[PDB]
Design a protein around this ligand. Sequence first.
Ligand code: NI
Length: 227
Amino acid sequence: MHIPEGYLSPQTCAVMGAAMVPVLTVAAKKVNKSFDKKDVPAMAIGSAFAFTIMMFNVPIPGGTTAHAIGATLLATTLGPWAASISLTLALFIQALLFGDGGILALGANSFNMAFIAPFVGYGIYRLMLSLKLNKVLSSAIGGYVGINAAALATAIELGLQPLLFHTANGTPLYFPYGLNVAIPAMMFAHLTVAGIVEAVITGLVVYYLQKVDEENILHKFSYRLRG
Ligand code: NI
């Protein structure tokens, strides 16, 4: 869903950066509150994992691109704040080093993929947990909803462009397609294939982490001491 350069007005870009600033500020403090030398490495690995996942994507005509993120997976494993930092970091790398996602677009994509996706996904996850679903199932479900929410947010941001930013001739200055085009394109891509991929990946890794703990008998003694 990464939005490229020139799709959003400088004003839109500015807005999302301003909205995203407090989010990252808070995440940092929360993370800052909870350090061992070691959770920093964790963030990096997650970040590298997400980055790698995102590299597998397809164009959506009338929208941007589609791919999975691993966002809810990160929120559920690291806590959402750390995930948002991890995720923001990956997009920043993509932007500065790969021309993938606009640099001016950093505020928007992070708002979508580093804030909305992991926070929504985490919330649905917690909700499904409260409905007594196992973590695997729950996380796959959270993953689906989180990524579709991010896609929606993207679609609304693109689709609003011709409405808000146009020439005196009615000519779109940036992204040229409306909500009528953008919502269906982005949501159809994300509600069907990509969201399934996200769910399966999130669930797969959780399952895998679940039973790895579930063994090394060592674990059953030391998990009540995790402090
Ligand atoms: Ni993207």
